[PDB]
Amino acid sequence: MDIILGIRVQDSVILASSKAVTRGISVLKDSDDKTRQLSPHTLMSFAGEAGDTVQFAEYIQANIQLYSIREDYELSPQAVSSFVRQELAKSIRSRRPYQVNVLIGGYDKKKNKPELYQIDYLGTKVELPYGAHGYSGFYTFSLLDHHYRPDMTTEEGLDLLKLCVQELEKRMPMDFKGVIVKIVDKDGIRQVDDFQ
Amino acid sequence: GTGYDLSNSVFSPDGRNFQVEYAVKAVENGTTSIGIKCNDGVVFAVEKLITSKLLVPQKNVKIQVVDRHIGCVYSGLIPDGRHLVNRGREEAASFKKLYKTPIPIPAFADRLGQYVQAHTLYNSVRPFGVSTIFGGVDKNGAHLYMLEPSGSYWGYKGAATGKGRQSAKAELEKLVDHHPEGLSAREAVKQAAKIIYLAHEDNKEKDFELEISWCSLSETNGLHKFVKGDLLQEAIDFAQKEIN
Amino acid sequence: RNNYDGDTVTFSPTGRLFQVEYALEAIKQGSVTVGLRSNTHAVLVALKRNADELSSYQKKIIKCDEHMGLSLAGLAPDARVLSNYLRQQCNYSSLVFNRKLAVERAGHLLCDKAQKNTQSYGGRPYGVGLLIIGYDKSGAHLLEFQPSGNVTELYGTAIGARSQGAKTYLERTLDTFIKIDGNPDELIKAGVEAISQSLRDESLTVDNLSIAIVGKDTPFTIYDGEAVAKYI
Amino acid sequence: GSRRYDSRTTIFSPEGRLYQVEYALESISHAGTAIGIMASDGIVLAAERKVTSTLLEQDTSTEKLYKLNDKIAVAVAGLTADAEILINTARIHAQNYLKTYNEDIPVEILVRRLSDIKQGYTQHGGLRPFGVSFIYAGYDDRYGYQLYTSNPSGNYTGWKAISVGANTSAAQTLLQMDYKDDMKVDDAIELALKTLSKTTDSSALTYDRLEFATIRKGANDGEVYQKIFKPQEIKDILVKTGIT
Amino acid sequence: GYDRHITIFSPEGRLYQVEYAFKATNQTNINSLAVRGKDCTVVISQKKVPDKLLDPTTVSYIFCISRTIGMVVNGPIPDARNAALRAKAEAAEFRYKYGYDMPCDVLAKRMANLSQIYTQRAYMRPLGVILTFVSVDEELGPSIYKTDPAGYYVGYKATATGPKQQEITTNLENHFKKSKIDHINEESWEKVVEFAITHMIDALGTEFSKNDLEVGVATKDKFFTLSAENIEERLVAIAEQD
Amino acid sequence: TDRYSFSLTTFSPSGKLGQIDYALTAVKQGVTSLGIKATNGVVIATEKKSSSPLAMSETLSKVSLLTPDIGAVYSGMGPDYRVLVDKSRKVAHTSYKRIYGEYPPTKLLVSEVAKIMQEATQSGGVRPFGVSLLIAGHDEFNGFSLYQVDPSGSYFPWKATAIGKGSVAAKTFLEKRWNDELELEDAIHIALLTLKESVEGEFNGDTIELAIIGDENPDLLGYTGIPTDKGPRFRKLTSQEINDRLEA
Amino acid sequence: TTIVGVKFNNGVVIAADTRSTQGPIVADKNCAKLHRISPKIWCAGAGTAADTEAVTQLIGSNIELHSLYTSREPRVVSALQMLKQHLFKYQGHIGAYLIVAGVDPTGSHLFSIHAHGSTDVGYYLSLGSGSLAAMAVLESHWKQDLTKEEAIKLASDAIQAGIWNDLGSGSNVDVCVMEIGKDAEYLRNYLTPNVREEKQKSYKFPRGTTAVLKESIVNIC
Amino acid sequence: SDPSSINGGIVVAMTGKDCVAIACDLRLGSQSLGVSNKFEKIFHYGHVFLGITGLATDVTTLNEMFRYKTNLYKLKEERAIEPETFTQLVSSSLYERRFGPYFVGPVVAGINSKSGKPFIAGFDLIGCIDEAKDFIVSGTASDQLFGMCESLYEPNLEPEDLFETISQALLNAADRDALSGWGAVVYIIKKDEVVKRYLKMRQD
Amino acid sequence: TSIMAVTFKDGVILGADSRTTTGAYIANRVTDKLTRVHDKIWCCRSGSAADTQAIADIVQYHLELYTSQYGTPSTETAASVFKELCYENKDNLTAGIIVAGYDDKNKGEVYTIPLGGSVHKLPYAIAGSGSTFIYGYCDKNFRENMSKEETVDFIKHSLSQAIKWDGSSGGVIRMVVLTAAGVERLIFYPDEYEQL
Ligand SMILES: [Mg+2]
Ligand SMILES: [Mg+2]
Ligand SMILES: [Mg+2]
Ligand SMILES: [Mg+2]
Ligand SMILES: [Mg+2]
Ligand SMILES: [Mg+2]
Ligand SMILES: [Mg+2]
Ligand SMILES: [Mg+2]
Ligand SMILES: [Mg+2]
Ligand SMILES: [Mg+2]
Ligand SMILES: [Mg+2]
Ligand SMILES: [Mg+2]
Ligand SMILES: [Mg+2]
């Protein structure tokens, strides 16, 4: 699989997501964004089988956009994640299941907390301080378990992450061509200008 | 209230279904047609009016066969009659496909019966504009039936319907009384020709072609066949001399 | 007067189906067409009707297979449905059974098709009449279809406005034309004559006359324009 | 066919009104009055039963007040049976929202769907509208206490106080005169009853002819409580308003 | 008023189409009656053959529904046959599904529920008929059950249907007031037929040849109709008591 | 071909729904039935109206068991009742027993019936039912209850009431007599009086049908061995049991 | 599982063990396998235990309804026909194997039904993993014209064969007796040969033995 | 490959005197990989408690679903559902999916508010009522639970003694299962009240 | 199983063994494989029990209905109906059926419908696993127009051999005799037929 990480610090949620897309023998691209913004303060990253990942995300996106317009209001990150889980849970008993895993990072304006949700292709959802999909957890959870504090600043979060990506570059057979990083905070969503 | 006669499944207050009654008028208004049971078969005959000399003689055949052993003939709205036979043919095929044996005539009567009665049940459909005379030879011998737009049907010794029906009915009543012992198939054919010629005299104004068929155990082998050539001629002769 | 003409599922107290009778009235208002046959050929001849002096002449003859076709008088779209339905039956007979479809059977199929619309709520009946000609395994044939469902086999006939003329002529011409065997052109000239006892205030041009013929060693084919100057 | 019997329930009059809706509203005007009043710290729902015998069982009766949800209730005016259909589909809409989003359903969202349902009966399928008007009282945390109304046309609107059913012109006027925004809930309770005293066509207003309910975030904890008053509680409140 | 044309309520709370369907039942001008023996059930029906061209053997308002159930119909034949077929189908399907022969009273109940539906739904018309079912039920003994176009049904000690129904009924009411029991006290069905014909001749004031009647008989485990000859036997027996 | 996909019950300009009104008229014309609620039971009762004395009136149940603890009776068109009983028994299984493994409580089963009735008041191509039902039952968390269901679909609970012909008279008569300390035997006594006014023919156990929702009847269970299943609370009275009481 | 059915001269009796197992584990030591289809028609199941419950509930219900419609006591042969037609429809995917016995107005009856929808009639029958032990006993002792008390003794012995010799069964013996005259008699734990001995020790803990991080009171209200 | 063994987890319930107890581990796994220690598998609907082991997506879904149905139930019966009835509900709801089922092992516990009886029950994945007064177990260490329970349990434990027992039964079983542990929670249920405790355990 | 039907002068006789096996276990040693579908039309069942019972139950239904409407059906009609079920459902049935009956027009008739649903009318027919062992014996001993007692013997001896050799056949021998006279059931026990 590709790399899908996320971490919830004190005032925001950081999503790190691999840039490579490879089709068998060649690496087709080294600059791919594995996220969609679902609403101004809600970000979804994703990974899994080709086509399915994007189709699914863009469908979730349009649904949340529809909701926002209709109610002139932005759903809580908790609600978005329950909606997404339910969609994935329908997929599994469907004729052709969506094979997609996602992380949802949001800033909840009403409670002024950041929230991270991990949901796999079966509809298994869980709220966590840090998470990952596929093998990404295997390399990085050791380090997060050790270093994570709930009161970390965004800067600390980004350091702790830098360390995680280094561990992945070192021990992981695949060249995932770096990561794109985004931050979701009370003022919305922005992308870290460079992960050098 | 009034207008009990505008809709088809409706009972008037005297208990009646006026649209079926009106369909009978469409029948009374058709040409004459008849059935005669002989004592191993049956004979059908029908007056074909000749509108014009431009009709091709021989060639507008009004008697229809069902399966191999059943003849139908009908007076009234001709396309309705044809529609009814198409149904009859599906029914006989289904019955035979499942039960192997060609459909027994009573069984087949009730098939038409139920389908016709069915068109008096609903206002979204219109009753059949024909009386149908039919029959053939089953494993219990010969049977002749007649079937009205209401889905009433019974067995007959003879039967008639259309404009000529009263002169024909009177004439058939003769035969019954003046042949209590039964009538042979070949004699029943000639009588049928006579009876059509007699019933034609309601509207001599028009010229007509005669058509006859028979299903007889000995003569056609329990299969339904049209009468033609010499035998047809011989029965038209018998009809000419019986007029003078 | 006449609550009984509101649809096709209603019989009148005399026993009539008014909606059907009103459909037959569309035919009489249509432009005239004539059909006739010998033992070797069958011929349609048709008078086409234009709207303006600026307009086309609506075609009245439609080919249905190599051995069969028809002319229409009345609601044109309706002929288009029926002729198409027929093309399919001619086709189905060829593909499945490798058999040219007999004219008698096409007759019966059209009858059964029209009859459907006259027993069911919601269906109007067809508003067109048709003359069909064909050459099949028993030689030349001509049929007249009415939207009541009645089809009748004839040596000749006509339908549409003033057709009573062409029909009376055919009744008298009968024994002349019935024997125009192995002669396509004579039989056409005898059809064109017929169709003339039917024109009021206009005569046949190159633009308004169409003709079709079929028979032994001659597939159903249609002449118009220059092709018809020959006989006008 | 059967289009003769079809009184077309979905058409416009030449003025552009929908016959059947107008007529259902007429129907509703003869139903028991119902009232909703919203305070800054709660909501009151009050309604008048259709004159009820002395033998009727008033404890288990629930003709006009219904729980949709732990946080939303309705007062009905019109056909009870029609309403219970609607109530029930709404209870389910709430559950579906709750199950999809793990969040209780916002009041408007519910009201809108239920009104969208009534609207459909008004535009397709030839059935008769639902002869019901609804007052909805609810709490959510996007707009706190809320009060809405809907009728057979599918239209809905929000209110600080409102009535449906009998004598609403009269009752609307009287609230308009006495409502103030700072209003506390026990003020609203009192106002609700004054209004029905004046409004009722029956010469007295007694406990056995009322249904009554409140929605309080009161008292200590931020949670919301729904109370449907029993006969004895309503009698007490009537003494305490010296309306008895 | 279209409340006259379809099965909806008049302002009096009435279904005129149902009323008019009852009226149609009498169109044949046939009377019928049924009675119960010790272990049989008999039905009797007039048989009229106005036309000389009809095959008489085909003219019947009595049906063998199943091995055990007989039905006689008061009303026009097309509707009779439609109801016959239906009941045949139902009785056979019941057996297949539940493993035993469909009982008279249950079949009556079912056929009545079908009628009830035509009274409630608009595109269906009621049938113009009255069905009288008879059997010897294995649980209930000889039984008679009657159904009409209202959707109504009840069991009977004995019963009669048709134009002259009233005459026949009062005649029978009287007989049982005397006899004090609900059945003909007779072992043999041949004499319960005799009773039935007799008590009918007296009520209609009219005499019968062998071609004027139809008879049906339900014994335990068979329902059958009689031929002109087994009837003739009965008419001779009656005549031996002048 | 069901063309009739439109309502046959519509609003008149005055706000009436004629067909529901007319159904109520059919009910009013029907034979009197009634029900009354005691503390340890409920009784429902009506008059058998033998159409011939040749008919066997035992074969006409006007009073029907719906579940072991719930019974019904009606005024109006009996056929409409017969098929509502079939329908109600079935819905008690499909929409309750098959799910929760216990029979529905009285009020819920009444909703279901009411609902069926409403549907015939609004759906395409049908008329409403021409009956009113009184339904009586017992369930563990609500105890004894008595409901009336009308053609409109509306229902309401009662301490006692009556429907059909003599109902205004009888409702008056029941108001005099009903108290909240009535024991079941006493309510039966009253039911019999209240019926007796409304009837001038023979009045006894053969012309009267009557059932109770009472104590559980283990003698009517059919099996023994499960101490947790006690009999049905519902029971029709015998021709005898009735006459017995026509002494008091 | 061991279940059997034995006719006697005035009726019929069925019996069953009380063990139910998931693989080699015993999930329930006292499971009741005797199911009622209607008061005088009972049923015992083997196979998938969710399928035998489901299908006895369902047919029980259709029977009750059909009984109410017909105003007749329900017949065994109806339970039989309804069961078999449903099992057949599902081609054996409903893993229900049953012995159904009862009394109706036509007399007393005993049938078995296999998952695919075949049925047997007999005077004595067994099914389940314990089937062959039980049948050995029935084949050894059954005689015609058993009295009731002999039939119970016999059916009880047959199940014991299964309990002892089969690992699929059992613990106790349940019995239902359906006699033509009477109410059906259901004897839960008619026989209980298998009581656990007192343990060598009590394992009640001293309180406070367990480590804890949090207490909350929980909201029912 | 086995859906009942991907996420892991256990639930056990037993009865005491006028009380019942019910408990679960807290581990959400994904095979070898521990994912969460805050996956409670015990839910409640009024005073009825439902433990669910098995595939976690389905645990979640079923809970969402029984919350939905017990909501509609309360709204119509105007009273909270009792355990005997809920059990039937669970059972019928699972058997609706007979040929495509939810991969779970439910357990019901509660006290009937009318009768006062302690009640517990369990089921297979297609919904056969495994009904037992003493105790019920479910999950990836159901074997080890059966063992602890059969030894430890004795009937009629007072609430504070029942707690000690069920706690021990759970912990020592989870410790012999790779795929359970990571914390644990125990509900003790009496007629009028309920106390919920988190247990200290090993984290490996 | 072993089953046969044989036409003789006065009508026709059907016989069968009475054993039902599931592998080597004899599930039922007193099976009735002679099954009535009309008064005087019966069949012999072989193949799957579920399939043949279910089919027979349907045929009986169809002929009950035939009878209600058209009177008594021909033995040929009954074979048509079996055939139609067997041919049209060949992909999920394992049923090998012999049909036999008597009427006055035709005396005894025997039709056999093997797997696949072909139908075959014959003077006699044999089937079931046990039949293979007696093709020789039967072809050698059947003659047309035997008496009843001759025919009961021909059957008794044919099936005693089929039983002797086939493990999936055994128990009692049942017969059903079909003639103008009515319907006679017969039974023969081991101590009789083993000894032949
Ligand atoms: Mg789902
Ligand atoms: Mg799966
Ligand atoms: Mg004119
Ligand atoms: Mg709706
Ligand atoms: Mg939703
Ligand atoms: Mg009993
Ligand atoms: Mg159990
Ligand atoms: Mg759901
Ligand atoms: Mg409710
Ligand atoms: Mg399924
Ligand atoms: Mg085979
Ligand atoms: Mg099949
Ligand atoms: Mg075999």
CATH label, F1-248, candidates 3.60.20.10, 3.40.50.300, 3.30.43.10, 3.20.20.30: 3.60.20.10
**Closest chain G residue to E106, measured at CA:** G70
Please report the number of interchain residue pairs, chain G to chain I, with beta-carbon separation below 8 angstroms: 29
As for how many domains chain D has, the answer is 1
Which subunits count as partners of chain A given 3+ CB pairs below 8 Å? Answer: D, H
Rounded to 5°, angle at Cα C217 from C215 and C222: 55
Domain E1-242 -> CATH class: alpha beta
Cα–Cα distance, D205 to D208 (Å, whole number): 9
Question: Which ligand minimizes its atom distance to the CA of G178?
Answer: 6
CB distance D49 to D33 below 8 Å: no
User: Taking the mean position of all CA atoms in its chain, how far away is CA D244?
Assistant: 25
What are the Cα distances from residue D118, in Å, to C151, D49, D65, D89, D132?
Answer: 53, 24, 20, 12, 9
D219: preceding bond cis by omega (within 30 degrees): yes
Dmax (CA) for chain E in angstroms is: 59
Cα(C156)–Cα(C175) distance, integer angstroms? 11
Contact F98 G69 (CB under 8 A): no
Angle ∠(G119,G123,G125) on CA atoms, nearest 5: 60
Burial code (b: 16+ CB inside 10 Å, e: under 16) for E48-75 equals eeeeebbbeebbbbbbbbbbbbbbbbbb
- Give the sign of the dihedral formed by CA I180, CA I186, CA I192, CA I196: positive
- Contact: E98, G66; criterion CB under 8 Å: yes
- In chain F, what residues touch H89 (CB-CB under 8 Å)? 99-100
Cβ atoms within 10 Å of F228's Cβ, excluding its own:
4
Q: Which one of D84, D117, D124, D208 makes the best mutation probe of the F interface by having the most chain F beta carbons within 10 Å?
A: D84
Report how far ligand 6's centroid is from the alpha carbon of G145 (Å): 26
Chains with at least 3 CB pairs less than 8 angstroms from chain G: E, F, H, I
Place of tokens 């997404």: A84
Q: How many CB atoms lie within 10 A of CB F130?
A: 29
SS3 F201: coil
Distance of residue D127 Cα from the nearest chain B Cα, in angstroms:
20
Beta bridge partners, E62, equal E72
Range of the domain at D170: 1-244
Ordered DSSP codes for I83-95: HHHHHHTGGG--E
Instruction: Quickly list DSSP for C111-179.
Output: HHHHHHHTTBTTPPPP-EEEEEEEEETTEEEEEEE-TTS-EEEBSEEEESTTHHHHHHHHHHHHHHHTT
The Cβ of residue C139 has, within 10 Å, a number of other Cβ atoms equal to 16
Give the residue numbers of I marked as catalytic: 1
The ligand that comes nearest to the alpha carbon of residue C27 is: 3
Report whether C155 contacts C191 (CB < 8 A).
no
Residue H89 C-alpha to ligand 6 middle, in angstroms?
A: 28
Q: For residue G119, what is the nearest residue in chain I, using CA coordinates?
A: I50
CA atoms within 13 A on the CB side of C161: 11
Ligand 13 center–CA I66 separation, angstroms: 30
Tell me the one-letter amino acid at C138: S
Spot the catalytic one: B2, B31, B101, B161. Answer: B31
Interface test with B, best of C16, C119, C163, C167 (most B CBs within 10 A): C119
Among the listed residues C25, C129, C31, the one whose alpha carbon sits nearest the alpha carbon of residue C79: C129
Query: Nearest to residue F161, comparing CAs of F40, F45, F30, F34?
Result: F34
Distance B71 CA to ligand 12 centre (A): 36
F26: closest CA of chain E, how far (Å): 4
Cβ pair H60:A123 closer than 8 A:
yes
Q: Contacts of residue B125 in chain D, CB cutoff 8 Å?
A: none
Q: What is the CATH number of the domain that holds C140?
A: 3.60.20.10
- Using the mean position of ligand 8's atoms as its centre, give its distance from the Cα of residue A75 in Å: 23
Q: Do H88 and F108 touch (CB under 8 A)?
A: no
- Which of D67, D91, D99 is the closest to H64 by Cβ? D99
Residue E140 at interface with chain F, using a CB cutoff of 8 Å: no
Residue B31 bears catalytic tag: yes
Distance of residue B106 Cα from the nearest chain I Cα, in angstroms: 8
Which of E11, E105, E172 comes nearest F54 by C-beta? E172
Report the C-alpha gap between E192 and F24 in whole angstroms.
46
Query: How many domains does chain I divide into?
Result: 1
Domain that holds residue A140: 1-196
Q: Write down all domains in chain H, each with its CATH number in brackets.
A: 1-204 (3.60.20.10)
Neighbours of chain D (3+ CB pairs under 8 A): A, B, C, E, F, H
Residue of E nearest to F21 (CA): E11
| Yes or no, beta carbons of A79 and D101 under 8 Å apart | yes
Which amino acid type is present at position F55? A
> Using CA atoms, how far apart are residues H203 and H190, in angstroms rounded to an integer?
31
Cα–Cα nearest to B133, from B229, B66, B220 = B66
Check if G121 contacts E (Cβ < 8 Å): no
C100 exposure class (CB count in 10 Å sphere: 0-12, 13-18, 19+): middle
Q: Which domain holds residue C39?
A: 1-232
Tell me whether E96 touches chain D (CB under 8 Å).
Answer: no
- What number of residues does chain F have? 248
Q: At what angle do helices H56-77 and D80-101 cross, to 10 degrees?
A: 160
Closest residue in chain C to residue D4, using alpha carbons only: C6
| Closest chain E residue to F117, measured at CA | E120
Q: Which of B99, B107, B110 sits opposite I80 (nearest CB)?
A: B99
CB contact under 8 Å between H88 and F140, yes or no, is no
| D124 to chain C, closest Cα gap in Å | 20
Q: Which residues of B touch D2 (CB under 8 A)?
A: 123-124
Report the alpha-carbon distance of residue F137 to residue F234 in Å, rounded: 8
Q: Are F234 and F68 in contact (CB under 8 A)?
A: yes
What's the one-letter identity of residue E136?
V
Q: How far is E10 from chain D, CA to nearest CA, in Å? A: 14
Contacts of A71 in chain D (CB under 8 A): 106, 109
Instruction: Please name which ligand lies nearest the alpha carbon of D125.
Output: 4
Question: What's the I103 CA to ligand 9 centre distance in angstroms?
Answer: 65
Question: What's the 3-state SS for chain H?
Answer: CCHHHCCCCEEEEEEECCEEEEEEECCEEECCEEEECCCCCEEEECCEEEEEEECHHHHHHHHHHHHHHHHHHHHHHCCCCCHHHHHHHHHHHHHCCCCCCCCEEEEEEEECCCCCCEEEEEECCCCCEEECCCEEEEECCHHHHHHHHHHHCCCCCCHHHHHHHHHHHHHHHHCCCCCCCCCEEEEEEECCCEEEEEECCCCC
What is the domain count for chain C?
1
Among candidate residues F87, F96, F73, the one with its CA nearest the CA of residue F115: F87
The neighbourhood of ligand 9, an ion, using CB within 5 A, equals H 76
Task: Name the residue facing D23 among F3, F13, F37 (closest C-beta).
Answer: F13
Residue of F167, F152, F206, F159 whose CA lies nearest to F187: F159
Range of the domain at G158: 1-221
What DSSP assignment string belongs to E112-135?
HHHHHHHHHBSSSPPPS-EEEEEE
Chains near B, with 3+ CB pairs < 8 A?
C, D, E, F, I
Check CB contact under 8 Å for E81 and B114.
yes
**The two three-digit tokens of residue F154, written as one number:** 């509306």
Q: Resolution limit in angstroms? A: 2.7
Q: How far apart are the CA of G32 and the centre of ligand 7, in A?
A: 5
Cβ–Cβ gap D5/E6 under 8 Å: yes
B7 touches chain F (CB under 8 A): no
* Interaxial angle between packed helices G49-70 and H83-95, expressed in degrees from 0 to 180 and rounded to the nearest 10: 100
Residue A128, domain CATH = 3.60.20.10
Q: Does E122 contact D at CB distance below 8 Å?
A: yes
Distance of CA H185 to the CA centre of its chain: 11
Q: Which residue has the tokens 């997506």?
A: H57
Read off the CATH number of the domain in which G192 is found.
Answer: 3.60.20.10
C-alpha G125/C-alpha A78 separation (Å) is: 60
**E187-221 exposure pattern, b = at least 16 Cβ within 10 A, e = fewer:** eebbbbbbbbbebbeebbeeebebeebbbbbbbee
Q: Is D1 on the interface with C (CB under 8 A)?
A: yes
Can you list the domains of chain B with their CATH numbers? 1-244 (3.60.20.10)
Cβ of B121 under 8 Å from any chain F Cβ?
A: no
- Cα separations (Å) of A61 from A35, A187, C128, F33? 10, 20, 57, 63
Contacts of A18 (CB under 8 A, 6+ apart): A2, A3, A4, A34, A47, A176, A177, A178, A179
Both tokens of A193, joined, read 């200008």
Domain count, chain G: 1
Rounded Cα distance between E124 and F211, Å, is 36
Looking at the partner chain, which of G48, G202, G207 has a beta carbon nearest the beta carbon of H154? G202
Contact H7 A93 (CB under 8 A): no
Smallest CA–CA distance from E122 into chain D, residue:
D2
